[PDB]
Every structure is written in structure tokens, then in C-alpha cells.
């Protein structure tokens, strides 16, 4: 947060479509925190779909020679065996 | 370590596409331990820009009510003060 943390613990009364927003996620009353306010929006964005955390470490190698090699337009660079299988067509062990 | 250490040193040969694929970032062997490929795929993979932060890091919020109450198709979780701004209007301190 580049927020001060005086900010973060402001007391705010959300308005009925923000309110009902959060509550919709388990807020359980009519005043927060921002800090409180964020992390209920961070569980309604994550309930929501809004935001997909698989697709923040993607290669998209589609029409490339490297999506050539591996045979697949994009791939996860969390996914480390998979990676070593698509590299292993491409060579040989000596 | 999800590949074991012992793997991730075999050493290996590129057949002729790989290979000139990882000399086209800076490669000089022909030979190449397993780790030594990935790194030289990483320099290619970023070189190309084939992963890139742009779309990274976002809330694409515009088909949801999120996107009416903070009046944008979208916005960035790096994005601090604008998301305080943004909520400041949906309430009263
Ligand atoms: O760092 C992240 C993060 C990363 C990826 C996805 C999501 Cl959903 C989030 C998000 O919540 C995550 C969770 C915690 O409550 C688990 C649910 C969030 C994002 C955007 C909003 Cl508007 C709210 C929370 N968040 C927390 C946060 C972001 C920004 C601020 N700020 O403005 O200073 C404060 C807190
Ligand atoms: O963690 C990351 C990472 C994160 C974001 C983008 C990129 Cl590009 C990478 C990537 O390279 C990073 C750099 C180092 O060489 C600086 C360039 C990479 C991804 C995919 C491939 Cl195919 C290769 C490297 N990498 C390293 C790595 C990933 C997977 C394995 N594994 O399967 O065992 C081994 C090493």
C-alpha cells in the first residue's frame, strides 16, 4: 500500500450498493475500516471471477516458433513439469 | 524444486530449432544442461515479450456492478490510491 496507514483505518459508512455488495460476500455490518472494505471487495473480485490468478503467469506463444516447438498456443511458467515434457520432444538426452 | 536437482543438471542437445532458437538470445553451445535451456527460453521467452506485465495484475470489472460503482471497465490492483478514490464516492466518512 502506498496508502498511509492512518488512511487504511478510516471508519467509512458504504452506501446501500456497496453495502449490499459487501455483505453478498458475508460483511457482517454497516461500518468498516478501509482496510476491511478492501479485503471483503478482494473476496467478492475473487467470488466474482473478476480477476483469474492462473492467467497472471502465462506465455502466449501462439504463432511464434517457441508455440511451434512446444505444440500449444500458451502454457503457465508455474507448471514445471510440463514445461520439461514440451522441452524434451525437442532435444536428446546425450 | 519441482523437477529434482539431478534432472535439472542432464545435460542435453537441441535439435536444430530449439538450438538456433536459444543462440538467436545469446547461446554459444551446442550442449546444454536442462537449467541452462530454461534460462536461455526465459531470455527468448521475455526478449519477445511472449509474457508481459500489461496484462498482469487487473480487475476487469466492466460487465459487473463493480464496474458501475467505480465507473471503469477495469483497474489495476497496483493501482492504491486510485482504488481509494474510487470507493471514496460509493460511501460517507
Ligand atoms: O492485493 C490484493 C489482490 C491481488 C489480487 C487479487 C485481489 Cl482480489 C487482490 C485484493 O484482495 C485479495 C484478498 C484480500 O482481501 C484475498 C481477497 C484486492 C484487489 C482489489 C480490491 Cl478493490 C480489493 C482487494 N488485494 C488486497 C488489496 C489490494 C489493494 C489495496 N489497496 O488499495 O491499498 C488493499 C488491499
Ligand atoms: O520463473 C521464470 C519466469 C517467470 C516469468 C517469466 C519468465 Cl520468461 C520466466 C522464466 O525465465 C525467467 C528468466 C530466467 O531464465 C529471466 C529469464 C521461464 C519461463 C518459462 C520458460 Cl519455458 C523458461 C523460463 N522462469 C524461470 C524458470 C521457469 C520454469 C522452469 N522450469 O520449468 O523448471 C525453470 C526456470
Redesign the pocket.
Known sequence: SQIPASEQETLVRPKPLLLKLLKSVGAQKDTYTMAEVLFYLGQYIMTKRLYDEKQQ?I?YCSNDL?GDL?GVPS?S????????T??YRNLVVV
Open positions: 503467469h506465455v517457441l512446444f502454457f511458467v508455474k507448471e514445471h513439469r510440463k514445461i520439461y514440451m522441452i
